């Protein structure tokens, strides 16, 4: 055959169609070898050395597995080789837009460097996909294997970012709506991107994943829902789906939002902001970009990877001294110090536009405790983390279709009360972590008093160690006693 | 070179002190080789071939690991070799009282054969332990290794069943209270027995365990709580403790309370009740016992194992024809056919004694459908399942002591609201299963109509497939529409 | 009836065609739930609780996987669903003939109980398969799914035992010759039966296997070899096939031929020989058989399982006292004591007829050391184990066909010298284990002197601990110095 | 505790003493986060993203485990906390000297760039260890925790490189000789560095390790050998040690010497040779070094990592155009083309002195075939691979001390003949791989004819695909027929 075989520790032997190999063997795809999946998490979990490259091969493989399983069970769906290849390409290419240290780049750096711009890795993936196709002559290779480039490039982009704008899609009609639920599920978040990273991250972190995606694929069918053909899970798998979201949330709490992994991502972002005026990345026509402007030119963005960290760390330029000093503090493990964690008790989230006021509010708290050192706004980092089941306040399982054994092609709905009284009553919450840039004993003691007083003033939850770190502050709050 | 080493697929190489080897190499302990850990579960999960013997080795190993870890971090606890051996023996011996097919025996058979008696496997473990020690001359071997048999045999039994009767224990004092939390934790259920069966059952079932017992052991300390020294977990582990109980509940729903596993245990129990007049087990002085009376004589109970199933299946005695016919139907997979599952609404909490009228109630339902068949009491089985976090309505984490990094000796409490708003708001519920002894198509159609009608009449939850199995019944209930 | 799914810890979710489910749900197949895969090995490796039932499901699954992979890559082979079902059934039923404790029954017991008869589990499998088909009305169900029972039952039997008697097979012609190398490979022993047991045993034993059967299946094709169509492996897999046989031999050394596992199997076989005059097994028309004659009647053999061990252990019959006493010594761990291991030198090979003389020869040795104890022939057990690569003196890889990427259509041969100088120069050897029934220190000291002297007298290899156990004997042998 | 815990996917929770944390949190140690364990192997096995950093934590952990196990079983050894910390430091620090892409750097690049110098990663580890200690004020911290830096730094260096010059060591006396066998075993190569890499590489590559280092540690003791106390293994582990070397060889055959991973390392080395003049690395006093001279100054070497690859790939400088074009061909997968593999027969050995002449010899072969293209020396790469059991022609197991259970303090030697006739007769062999820098069809056809002709002329082994790639050449050699 002309298929290549790649051995992966998660999936075993992955067979790749020659069109997929041509897409993978490009500078635009190979770039993902130099972007860590968990960014700063590697500095907490040493097994987490994995890159977006191997995750992308796994997403492309699982996308192919699911569409083949549906076509084998229900030939009447008329799934073509063309459909299979287009779903695999979208799976392979949905991580193309990631920047240095993955979620650090679009979650922390671009918001602070370029607040005027609205940028996501998903839009990056669509722009990088266009640059990959056009720079490497892929459209004629697509046609050679039976694809229709105009329709199928549209279909691939829609699978990653949704409608580029009643059926809102142009790449495929309503009778193939199920194809859009495999790579990036906009309806309920159940997709092969999560299935790969749960298993891969768990393998590398040394933590346990409870989600059985092979069982899910075996039980998956397509059903009619409101004039669309969609993916329906077997009714009895509903508990396994609730457990999938519980697992996702558990992996966010223990690993992806680890308090020290997040501070290392914050310190790396700070070094990038201090380096951004001085690093030059050449793009199209020899034009020079910066870390923050390389997102505007895919030829420049192609060369923007975790390498930026080492380019700064190893620099001799006096201009890069400040950026270099922050990364040196990461190496000596002189990190900003974790003060504590709290949650809002209210139902209205802290909004992103309020994030910058929060350090001033902590510094404005007046703890009734003797303090030697006085801290300022600039001494505090306040990190707000949205934890949910992928749909804000909504239950994603209310947006899943199920079938029963007696009518395997008829969609039904299952409510939370039909499953268990032991499930969550709420599907979204915020975590607030506070850190201090002053690392001495006296500064950290003070930071704790300001923190717990701010919690009390804002009616947030009592920090788990509140009575130990702030014994004179916690008694003032009756809700805490 | 006095110790023996056993290779276990869960724990790797387990070292056993010579005293432990002498206890294991007895007819009373080796009997656990012939009792399946999951009983009827093996007939649904063919990986689940494992027996109570290998689970017991694991419990004794983990009990040793925890007591050694505590002694090591806190030498001021004065943990002795004597304390370590007594904890390991209680760990190895806490499963000794299990009968044929494990929880089938004390969960289904003894309650129906001997309703007057209050029998648990734990009381069995204490009686079997006494018989093991006395039949095999163990007390002199205990003295040889520094144990004081009067105090230490009391300690071992108390670790399994609790106070044999202000400090209610005689085996060890208040300053060693923590030792009583290792093998069977009566305060919150967090103990090494669960840690072994999560990891061992997951390995055999082919399902994944997320609980990292090694991490928990590494972070565990002893703290002063109300004039006792108790085990305190690091504050940061509180999320991992909620996950442990989530995993336990997930394993109950998927595996231990599998609808078909439960009906096979029900059919085996029915065969045992029909064989009980005829089967003989030889006990002390050649006296004959029955399946139901072997619990009264430890020499007889020693020979009461899963072998009873095959003695019935292979019998030629006409008296055993009815018992043998039930087991033959298991082999042909002619099982009582699953009709569906429902839940009580409100706080309707069947605490037992109504199990007898439930089949009559289903048959008394009047579904508004044309049926060719009419079924009665003898055609229905109704199973009640209590699902909880081990303490009925209570949150076990409210009964855990934590410590913080800044004051490792100060016990604190952590409430659900200090952890996450995404946790369960309830910790207990009931499931109701219904099955039909008639297996033909006409009888199964009728049984479905009676079932869904009964659910509607009792205001139970709508069965997940209700609209497909009973399309003419479901519209009568508006709460369902 | 539709597909069933069984969750297996080795293979994950196995889908079973309704015809396969009907074959599995019979007393003849379900019997395999009560036969331990590794027999006495469970008494050394407590993870090894697995039975022939779950191994058989795995063999049927892998047989399906390989035939599907060949048919997918080479549609010109004309592989039919009929062919796939027949291969799966042969895979499922190849273990049907196993007796109590698997290889102990046909390897040790039947040869000693019935030396006149030639019995193998393979012949048993064919007889049990015939009994299963005829007793359970399978033929009509076969016809319903497109099988032709006359040809296809012949084909199934030939896959298990070979030609029942130029092409020697009647079930399929030469153009489907490759179908006969999947379930039981008579040409080189590379088959799906080994692939399942390596992975299953390793998972249960707690030991690691290096054989990637998925990779092998991915690279497998069918090639013309001397006017047959045979399975050909990719050239690059030749190293992995040498490693497969090294792994098998390693698992035999560590596990299947463990010295203590083998002595437990020896003691069980002795108990069975002592019980054989007295145990009655009812077969067809109420005729009575013995353990050794149940092989003559499949209705009797259906009820001959590991249960016979417990029937003896729990017996009160004075006739069974001697048999029962041996099994009681196993429970107390009063086993015959391993003295040592040696090998014949040069090409010297001990014949089966001479096994019985070996205990007398050891007892006839004259150590030339002062002993207070004299041992007799009856005090020694001598176990002779033939270790090979499954074809006696032959290299099985000389009987593999390979293909290169430059010409997938040209079958080639690869010699040992084309692969590595680090491979074995011999493919068969014999190990001789000696054990002593007298366990006291004086008796074992003496047994050691007799053993090392016998080795010296026969010119066998120096036992590894020779100089320590027999320091006065080892210097007399110059070939050892 | 002031101990840190690191979660590792191979070892679980690793506890680190504060002195070890101070050594790890340095630029010299953290550098190992940017060196791939398997270099070019990542470009063949996408799971192999792991770096030397996490391997080094595992080696330090296992070194601790082994020394603690010996001290617990044999307190009379008088193993001190000082001994344990010195062994852990040597374990952590033995990989410090690795350069970019690990074995590529000292195996391929330095020998070609600086043929006059004799450099190994081991010498690098000692020089960087000295730089780490001196640059970061570690000597005072060592004294604070009871180390004596004069003796103990000597001891650490000797563990990595051997005697810095019959007891040849100065760091510890003969009665602690066993300490020198833990991190880098110069006597037989059985050490904790291999144990970590087998498990860690197998986990990432997705291939299986069968070496059980925990079992080995459990059975290890210290014995008297020629006035030294050395590590003695249990005699029964001799089979498992032969298997350890077999696994090592298999990992080299499949992974570390993969033909494509080796050609990618060759192409990276070629890019580094083309860039060596132009890349400037600042060392001590602002002096500038090259890639090839950074080994001369540890301040420069600290900044020499896999980053060099990306600095070249992302350069715009015309000086780096040639180097950059080689790396761009790697990204497009336009690699030098593998022609074939052969071996010298019997004891024939190619020495390093031969390596440069080999391409000319292949080009000098005169295949009797019509060729369109004529190839030159410059068009061929010839890679010579030494495969052995770590001691050239010698059997490492002849250099192991064993002990038997009858006398645990008596060291014994076990020969190959006392173990098995199925073991290797030879412990060293050579592979010769030939590649072509011309990648078109006509040049590859020609290269194959020259290669197979050269094999025939030198009496090398027939390439496995010889009959297919060179059907007109193979007939000249009758031994090849
Ligand atoms: N599990 C496993 N994977 C292997 C082994 N050898 C290589 N691989 C992996 C490395 C790659 O991810 C993948 C493909 O390498 P292969 O040696 O199968 O093919 P390659 O293209 O190098 O050779 P070819 O062009 O077919 O001659 O398989 C092995 O023995 N076991
Ligand atoms: N992982 C592993 N387990 C093994 C191996 N050989 C034996 N075992 C298992 C079987 C038992 O559960 C445990 C102890 O068996 P051994 O063969 O070490 O001890 P045995 O008592 O037969 O020998 P001994 O009394 O020490 O001469 O280890 C092996 O090579 N690998
Ligand atoms: N991995 C895994 N296996 C499960 C789970 N639930 C059941 N199994 C296993 C048990 C059986 O070997 C296999 C199929 O059992 P199911 O519960 O799917 O089938 P059952 O015949 O009870 O249900 P059905 O006839 O389809 O209503 O899967 C689960 O949540 N995860
Ligand atoms: N297996 C496992 N590892 C975890 C989990 N949370 C964190 N880790 C890993 C990350 C690190 O490699 C190691 C120690 O991390 P911790 O979060 O326990 O330590 P950290 O220094 O952040 O907390 P501390 O200074 O003790 O408050 O454990 C978890 O839930 N499970």
Residue numbers in the entry:
A (entry chain D), B (entry chain B), C (entry chain C), D (entry chain A): 113 to 277, 284 to 599
Provide the publication's sentences verbatim.
pmcSterile alpha motif (SAM) and histidine–aspartate (HD) domain–containing protein 1 (SAMHD1) is a dNTP triphosphohydrolase (dNTPase) that hydrolyzes dNTP substrates into their deoxynucleoside and triphosphate (TP) subparts. First, the enzymatically active SAMHD1 tetramer is formed when dGTP/GTP and dNTPs bind to two allosteric sites of SAMHD1, A1 and A2, respectively. In addition, SAMHD1 dNTPase activity restricts HIV-1 infection in nondividing myeloid cells. Here, we investigated the structure and functions of SAMHD1 R366C/H mutants, found in colon cancer and leukemia.
R366C, found in both colon cancer and leukemia, and R366H, found in colon cancer, are located in the enzyme's catalytic site. Notably, the R366 residue coordinates the γ-phosphate group of the substrate dNTP in the catalytic pocket. In the catalytic site of WT protein, the R366 guanidinium group neutralizes the negative charge of the substrate dNTP γ-phosphate and interacts with D506 to stabilize the bound nucleotide. For both the R366C and R366H mutants, we crystallized the HD domain of SAMHD1 (residues 113–626) in the presence of dGTP, which is capable of binding both allosteric sites 1 and 2 as well as the catalytic site of SAMHD1 (29). An established catalytically inactive mutant (H206R/D207N; SAMHD1HD/RN) was used to prevent hydrolysis but retain binding capacity of dGTP during crystallization. Crystals for R366C and R366H diffracted to a resolution of 1.9 and 3.6 Å, respectively. However, unlike WT protein structure that displays dGTP substrate bound to the catalytic site, no nucleotide density was observed in the catalytic pocket of either mutant, thus confirming that substitution of a cysteine or histidine side chain at residue 366 renders SAMHD1HD/RN deficient in stably binding dGTP at the catalytic site despite tetramerization. Interestingly, the dGTPase activity of R145Q, Y155C, P158S, and R366C is severely impaired compared to WT SAMHD1 activity. The loss of the interaction with γ-phosphate of the dNTP substrate at the catalytic site is directly supported by our observation that dGTP is absent in the catalytic site of the crystal packs of both R366C and R366H SAMHD1 tetramers even though we observed two dGTP molecules bound to the two allosteric sites in the same crystals. The two stable R366C/H mutants were able to form tetramers comparable to WT SAMHD1.
